[PDB]
């Protein structure tokens, strides 16, 4: 599941996003998001640069 | 040339 050694579902950031809630993450374009959980159709959780939390799915592109 | 998107709707329920 989520506890595996691999990076699970990954994406690249297409646009800046500034976290807007205590449970959100930020990223810059071209940052990689790893270990994605599709908890909701529109907002996903993942890990980006040591930070875990929620982000808008349409700001990333799944690799590949 | 290129569009930054509207944010998706807040999570369902």
């Amino acid at each position: 599941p989520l506890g595996s050694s691999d990076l699970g579902i990954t994406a690249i950031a297409l646009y800046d996003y500034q976290a807007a809630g205590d449970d959100e993450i930020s990223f810059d374009p071209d940052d990689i998001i790893t270990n994605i959980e599709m908890i909701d159709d529109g907002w996903w959780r993942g890990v980006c640069k040591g930070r875990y939390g929620l982000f808008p799915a349409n700001y990333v592109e799944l690799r590949q | 040339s290129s569009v930054v998107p509207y944010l998706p709707r807040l999570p369902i329920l």
């Binding site: 529109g42 | 998107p5 509207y6 998706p8």
Partner: protein, 129 residues
């Protein structure tokens, strides 16, 4: 997720696609093969500013909302990211709207080009279903 051929056939049959709008299961498997090579994460941008999403490459102008497609409809009433899930529920429910909208499976350019009028039963031979 990249589906196995038979794995996808079983899941599509589970979700009601076999003979849906009169299209045998092989049509649907075949369409996913040539749209996305069975990859639930396939995402392809178009020069009109729309994008095709998921296993059946559903387009953001009419069908789903990606936030970045100008003058778009959202007739499946879902974010396009819904179509990028590892299970196929949202792509199947949307696909049923599309194939029922007047042009049947001709909505899928890869189906028209690679599946229509071929022996689409091939796509389900050997599968336990």
């Amino acid at each position: 997720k990249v589906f196995g051929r038979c794995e996808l056939a079983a899941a599509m049959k589970r979700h009601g696609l076999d003979n849906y709008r009169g299209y045998s299961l092989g049509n649907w498997v075949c369409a996913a093969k040539f749209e996305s090579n069975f990859n639930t994460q396939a995402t392809n941008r178009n020069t009109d500013g729309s994008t095709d999403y998921g296993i059946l490459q559903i387009n953001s102008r009419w069908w789903c909302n990606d936030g970045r497609t100008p003058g778009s409809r959202n007739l499946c009433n879902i974010p396009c990211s819904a179509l990028l899930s590892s299970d196929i529920t949202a792509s199947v429910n949307c696909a049923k709207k599309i194939v029922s909208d007047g042009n049947g499976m001709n909505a899928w350019v890869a189906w028209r080009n690679r599946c229509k009028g071929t022996d689409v039963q091939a796509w389900i031979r050997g599968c336990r279903l």
